[PDB]
C-alpha cells in the first residue's frame, strides 16, 4: 500500500525493478517512469509525487563522469534526492548508492545505503511508518494541537473537578471515557456536516467543561456525550483544516473522485489517528480513558 | 531583515558578492560560506538553513564538465532541489548563466538568467506578502482558526445578533472582534499569556448561542469586553506552533537563540498575514475583525 | 538487556562477533556496524549511541601503522574511545587492546584489557551495573537531591517530633513507613498528572511535616499518606525534570513511541530507584522505614 | 576569566601561543603543557580538565603519517578531541584543522575550523557563553526542575487564586512578585543553613500556595515571603544537590580552599542563574514577576 | 578474610600462588594481578590497595641485575614495598626475600624474611592483627581520644563523686556499668541519626556528670543511661569522624554499595572496639564496669 | 621554616645543592646526607624523616644500568614510594631526568623533569594551604571537632537563640565563638590549660538547649563569657594529638626535642588551618567563629 517513489537514471532500469521486487507486496513501489503525467513539466510531476509518495528510495550510480575524473551520481537523481529530502526528510527519503558512486560533497560522512541492504532499508521503512513528524499537510501538528488543547485539557478538567456543565446545571462524572471519532472520509466543506449528522444520529447531548472563578481567563470546552458514566464522543473539527490544506497541497483543475487525493486524505487521517493514539498512551490523565475510532462510516 | 540563503560553488565567489550588493541592504542574505555551523555535517546545516532561510537564489554556472555537457556542480543542484522541496518553487530560485545545460528535469522551466537580480528582488517582494503551506503550520493554523473560529463566530453573531453567558442571552447591537497575537510565543503555549491578558482587562466569558434546531453543533466560548461588544481573543492554536517549532528545530540548548526567535516571529507574522488577508476574503469578517499583531 | 556498544575497525569484524559471543545473553550487544543510522553523519550516530549505550567495549588492534614505526590503534577507534570515555567514564567505557597495539601516549600506565579477558570484563560490568554515578541525565543527582531534601528530611522530622500536620490539626505518628512510588512510565508533561491520578485513586490524605517556631527558616514538607500508623506514599516530582532533560538529551524530530527513549527513560527510572534504595540502606533514620516501589502501573 | 583547554602536539607549540594571543586576554586559555598535574597520569588529569575547562579548541595538524599514506594528526589530539566532545559537547569543543590533515572518517564531512579563524571561534565561544547545555553535574537540569516544579507552579498558583494560605488564614495577594536568591558560595551542608540564616535576618514568613479541594492529589508549596504586595523570595534548595554532585564530579582527598572547586562551583551557580533568568522570560506568568538576585552575601 | 596484598614481579607468578596456598583460609589473599582496576593508573591502583589491603607480603627475588654485578630486587617490587611500608609500617608490611636478592643499601642490617618462613610470617600477622596503631583512618586515635576524654573521664568522675546530674537534680550511683555500643554500620551523616534512634527506642534518660565549683574550668559529660544501678549506654559520636575521613580516604566517583569501603569501615569499627577493649583492661577505674558492644543492629 | 626531605643518590650530589638553592632560603631543605641519625639504621631514620619532613623532592637519575634499562637507584625509588605512602601523591615529588625509565608502576604518570624546581616550589606553596589526612589525626580531629561541636553548637544557638545554665534559659541576642588553640601541647592534654584559662577569665559553663522532642540528643556544655555572649573554648580533642604524637614518634628520652616541638606545632597549625577553612565552608559558622591560634 505505502507509496514509495523509486527514482533512478534511465539506464538503471533493471536495478529499479529488482528493488521493486525486493520489497514486493504491502508497498506500492512507483518508479519514476510511470510517475510522469502527460502534458506536464518534469519538475511539476516530481514535486507532485513528492506530495504523494510516502517515502523515496532514489538510486545513485556510476554515471556522469564529472570534473573538479570522478564517477558521480546523476544530476537528475541528485536533484530528485535533494527535493524529496527537503520535502520529506532523511527519516523518509533514502539514497541507495553502489560501491563507489562519489556522493556530492554535501553528502559526505553521511552513511547512505550501499540485497540485504534493501532488507534493512525496508525494516527502517516500517520503523518510520510508526512515526509521525511534521509535514506540509499538518496532520501531525493538528493532532498535537487537538490533544494539547482539547483532549488533554478536557481529560484533566474532568479528572480534576468531578463535573461537566450541561445547560448550566452540573452533572457529576463518576466514570469517564471519551471516544475520538475520525471520519472515514473528509467532506469538501470540512467535518461540520458529518459532525452534525453523527451527533444527531446518537443522543450525544451537548455539555461543556465546568470552570471556576479561581481562574478568570480559562476557556470552556463544549462537547457531546452520552454519578453518571459518560461516553464522551468527539469528532475533531481540526480535520477541516486538513481538507483546506489539501486544496493548497495539490491544487486540482478538475472536479471528480481523485484517487491520489483520496489516498492522501486517508493517509492524513491515518497519521492523525496514529498521533492521537500515541499522545493518549503518553499522559496518565488520558491513558485508558480516551479511545480512538478510525475509519468511521 | 529578510533571510536569504545564497548558495554557489566554492570557486564562484565574486558573483556572490555582486548579487549580495544587488539584492540590496534591507534584506539579510546569508552566504553558504558562513551558513555551515561548526561541528555539524554539511547536509545537516543545509537542512537547518532551509528551516531558517526564507528564500533561495542559488547560482548555477559552468563549473564541472561532464559526460560534453558543461553542467553546474552537483552540490549546487542538490541544494537547489533541497530548497525547492523544502520551501517551494517561488521561495527558491536558480540563477543560471547563458549556457549551463541544467538537469533535464529542469528543462523547459523558467530559470533566471544585475537587472536579473533586481527582477528576482521584485519577485521576492511579491512572495513576501503571499503565504505558502509550511512544514510548521503557520498558514494552515491560520486557515483553521479563521474557518473554525473567526468566520464561525462572526457568522453566528451576525445571525442571532445575540451571545450567551451563564444562560443570559445578551443582545449584540454592534459586533466586531480582535485577534490578539502575542509578541513572543510562550513556552507552555499561549495559555498563560491568555490568562494574564484576560485577567488584566475585563474580558468576560461568553458563548455563541446555539439554536435548538442544530442539535449537533457546539458553541464557541470566547472572551469579550443591545450593546457594543468589544470582542477579542488570543488564538489558542498558537500553542501548536510552539510544539511544531521543536519538531521543526530540535536543539539540546536552553537559552536565548536568535535563529529560533527569528523563526518563531516569522511564523507569527505569517499567521497574522494569512488572517488579515482572509478577513478581507469574507463579508461577515470585514471591518468586524482586526489584528493586533505583536501585543506586549 | 543492557546495551553495549562494541566499536572496532571494519577489518576487525570477527573479533567483534566473538566478543558478542563471549558475553552473549542478558546483554544487548550492539556493534558499530548497526549503530549508524541512515542519512546521518557518522559523528552524529556515534554521539547518539553514546547517549544510549550503557557501556562500551571498544576494540583497539594493530592497524594504522603510524610515524613519530609503531603499530598504533585506529583513529576511528581512538576517537570513539575518547568520546565514550568522556561521556560515560572509565567505570563504564572499556578498551580491549591486543598484545602490542601501541596505545596513545595519553593512555600510558593505564591497565587496559588485554577470552578470559572478556570474562573479567563481564564481571566488572556486572559490578558497575550495581553502581550509579553522575550522567547527562541527572537520575543519580536527582535521586540524591530527592533523598537529601525530602526523604531524609521527612524521615528525620517525623522521627524527631512525633507528629504530622494535617489541615493545621496535628496527628501523632506511632508507627512510620513511607513508600516511594516510581511510575512505570513517565509522561511528557512530567509526573503531576500521574501523581494526581494516583493520589485520588487511593485515599492519600494530604498532610505536611510539623514545623516549630524554634527554627524560623525551616521549610515544611507536604506529602500524602494513609497514635496512628501512617502509610506515607510519595511519587517523586523530581522525575519530571528527567522527562524534561530527556528532551534535551535526545532531541527528536518525530512524534511516536520510540524504543530508544523508552529504554533510556526506563533505565533512568531504574537508576533513580537504585540510588534511592542505596540511600535508604544508608541512614538509620530511613533504614527499614522507607520502601521503594518500582515499575508502578 | 573563562577557562579554555587548548590542546595540541608536543611538536606543535608556537601555534599554541598564536592561538592563545588571538583568543585574547579576557579569557584564561590554559595550555595542555601545564594541564598535566604532577603525580597523576595523563588520562586522569585530562578528565579533570574536562571537568574544569569550559570550552576546547584542540589543534589537528600534519603530525603523524599513517597507513589506512595519510597525514593524520596525532592519536593523542584526536583522543583528546573525542574525550572533550563526549564530555562537553559538539559546540563546547572545536577542532582547528589545517588545509590537509585527513581527520578520522568519523569526522569526515563535518565542519572543522580551518587569525580570522580564531576570532570566528571566539565569537562562537561568546555565543555558547549565554546558552546552557545539559551537564554531568546538573546545573541546567536543576534549574529546569526548579522552574517547572516551583517557580512556574508558584507563579501560576498565585496568579490563579491571587491568595496564599498561612496557618489557615487566606491572605490576599493584590500584587505578586518573587526573587530567586542564589548564594554567592555553596554551603557545605547545602543551602539549608544559609536559607535559615537569611530567613532569620529578614522577616521572611512561611506561606503555602492555596490548594482548592477539587485537586485532591496536589500538594502546596510552602515558601518564605515578605490584598497586599508580597515581596516573595526564596533560595532554591535544589542547590544542595549541586554540592553532592560536585564531589561526584571532582572527588579529592584534600580539605581546604581549592581554586578549581571555587571556579567550578561558581560557574555552576552562574549557569543555574542564567538558565532560570532565561526561563522566566520564557513564560508570561513568570515575566516581570520574578527576578534573580545572583551572588547574595 | 584479612586482605593481604602479595606483590611480586610478573615472572614470579608461581611463588605468588604458592604463598597463597601456604597461608590459605581466614585471609583474603589478593595478588597484584587482580589488584589493578581497569582504566586506572598503576600507581593509583597500588595506592588504592595500600588503602585497602591490611598487610603485604611483597616478594623480592633475583631480577633486575643492576650496576654499581649484583642481582637486586625489582624496581616495581621495591617501589611497592616502599609504598606499603610507608603507609602501613613494618608491623604490617613484610618483604619475603630469597637467598641472595641484594636488598637496597637502605634495607641493610634489617632482618627480612628468607615454607616455614611463611609459617612464622603468619604468626606475626596474627600478632599484629591483635595490635592497633595509628593510620590514615584515625580509628585508633579516635578511640584513644574517646577513652581519655569521655570513658575514662566519666568513669573517674562517677567513681569519685557518687552522683550524676539529671535535670539539675542529682541521683546516686550505687552500682556503675556503661556499655559502649558500636553500630554495625556507619551512616554518611555520622552516628547522630543512629544515636537518636537507639536512645529513643530505649528509655536512656539523659543525665550528665556532676561538676563542682572547686574546679571552675571542668567540663560536664552528658550521656544516656537506664542508690540506683545505672546501665549507662553510649554510642561514640567520634565515629562520625571516621565516616568523614573515609570520604577523604577513598574518594569515590560513584554512588552505590561499595564492598571495598564496606569492608574498610567494618574494619575501622573493629579496630575502634579493639582499642577500646584494650583501654578498658588498662585502668582500674574502668576495669569491669565498661563493656564494648560490637556489630550492633 | 618548612622542612623538606631531599633525597638522592650518593653520586648525585651537587644536583642536591643546586635544588636546595633553587628551592630558596625561606624553607629548610634537609638533605638525606645529614638525615641519617647516629646509632640508627637507615630505614628507621628514613621513617623518622617521613614522620618529620613535610614534603619530598627526591631526584631520580641515570644511576644503575639494568636488563629488562637505565633506572635510578633502588634506594631512590624505595624512598620515593615510602614517602608517597607516608605523605601522599602531592606531598612527595620525583625529579627525573629526560631518560631514567622509571618503574612501570610509575609509567604514564607526571614526574617533574631550574624552572622545574621553582614550579615544584609553587606547588609546595599550594599544598601548604591545603590539608591531607595524616597518620596522626590533625585534620581528622579538626573535622570531628567542627562537625561534632562547632557546627553543632552554632546551629543550636542560631536555632533556639537561647542557652541554658543551671536551668536558667538565658537569651542569646548576639552570638559568636572563639577557638583557643594553645601555643604548646600540654603533656596531660589541654585539660589543665583549659582549667587555667577558664579560671583566668570569667568563663562560665552553659549548655545548648535541648528541646523535649529530640529525646536521644545530648547538649554541649561549654564555657562562655538577650545578651552578647563572648563564647570561646579550647578544643579538648587536642589531648588526643598528644597521645598520637608518641604513637607517631616514640622515644625513650625526656627533654626538649626540636623534632617533636616542630611536629606538634605543625599539627596545631594544621588543625587551626582546617578549622579556619571549615568555618568559611559553612554559613552558620561564618563570621560567628574565629580562631585565636597560639594563645599563651
Ligand atoms: N469539542 C470541542 N473541541 C475543541 C474545543 N477547542 C478545541 N477543540 C479542538 O482542538 C482543536 C485545536 O484547538 P486549538 O489548538 O486550541 O486552536 C483553535 C482555537 O484557537 C480556536 N477555537 C476553536 N474552537 C474554539 C472555541 O470554542 N472558543 C474559542 N475562544 N476559540 C476556539 O480555533 C483553533 C482551531 O480550532 P479547530 O479547527 O476547530 O480544532 C480544534 C478543535 O478540533 C472545544 O471547546 N470543544
Ligand atoms: N512531597 C514533597 N516532596 C518534596 C518537597 N520538597 C522537595 N520534594 C521533593 O525533593 C525533590 C528535590 O527537592 P529539592 O532538591 O530541595 O529542590 C526543589 C526545591 O528547591 C524547589 N521546591 C520544590 N518544592 C518546593 C516547596 O514546596 N517550597 C519551596 N520553597 N521550594 C520547593 O524545587 C526543587 C525541585 O523540586 P522537584 O522537581 O519537585 O523535586 C523535589 C521533590 O520531588 C515537599 O515539600 N513535599
Ligand atoms: N556522650 C558524650 N560523649 C563525649 C563527650 N565528650 C566527648 N565525648 C566523646 O569523646 C570523643 C572525643 O572527645 P574529645 O577528644 O575531647 O574532642 C571533642 C571536643 O573537643 C569537642 N566536643 C565534643 N563534645 C563537646 C561538648 O559537649 N562540649 C564542649 N565544650 N566540647 C565538645 O569535639 C571533639 C570531638 O568530639 P566527637 O567527634 O563527638 O567525639 C567525642 C565524643 O565521642 C560528652 O560530653 N558526652
Numbering used by the authors:
A (entry chain D), C (entry chain B), D (entry chain A), E (entry chain F): 2 to 69, 73 to 118, 130 to 241, 252 to 322
B (entry chain C): 2 to 68, 73 to 118, 130 to 241, 252 to 322
F (entry chain E): 2 to 69, 74 to 118, 130 to 241, 252 to 322
Paper passage:
Stimulator of interferon genes (STING) is an antiviral signalling protein that is broadly conserved in both innate immunity in animals and phage defence in prokaryotes. Here we use cryogenic electron microscopy to determine the structure of the active Toll/interleukin-1 receptor (TIR)–STING filament complex from a Sphingobacterium faecium cyclic-oligonucleotide-based antiphage signalling system (CBASS) defence operon. To define the molecular basis of STING filament formation, we reconstituted signalling of the S. faecium TIR–STING (SfSTING) antiphage effector in vitro and used single-particle cryo-EM to determine the structure of the activated complex. In each SfSTING dimer unit, the canonical V-shaped STING CBD is positioned above two TIR enzymatic NADase domains that dock against the base of the receptor.
The TIR domains are not as well resolved in the main double-filament class, probably owing to conformational heterogeneity, and we therefore focused structural analysis on the single-fibre filaments. A 3.3-Å-resolution cryo-EM reconstruction of the dominant class of single-fibre filaments reveals that SfSTING oligomerizes through formation of a repeating laterally translated array of parallel stacked protein dimers that buries more than 3,000 Å2 of surface area between two pairs of dimers and locks the STING cyclic dinucleotide (CDN)-binding domain and associated TIR effector domains into filamentous assemblies capable of reaching greater than 300 nm in length. In the SfSTING–c-di-GMP complex, individual dimeric units adopt a two-fold symmetric conformation and form the basic repeating building block of the filament structure (right). Compared with the modelled open apo state and partially closed 3′,3′-cGAMP-bound conformations, recognition of the signal from the correct nucleotide, c-di-GMP, induces an inward rotation of the SfSTING β-strand ‘lid’ region of about 25° and about 9° respectively and results in formation of a tightly closed complex. Thus, complete closure of the lid domain and structural compression around the high-affinity ligand c-di-GMP is essential to translate CDN recognition into a conformation sufficient to seed STING protein-filament formation and downstream signal induction. The primary STING filament interface occurs along two surfaces that pack between adjacent SfSTING dimeric units and drive lateral head-to-head oligomerization. These surfaces centred around the hydrophobic residues V280and A309 are exposed in the closed SfSTING domain conformation, explaining a key mechanism that couples c-di-GMP recognition and filament nucleation. Individual STING-domain protomers (STINGa and STINGb) within the SfSTING filament are also bridged by an electrostatic interaction between STINGa R307 and STINGb E290.
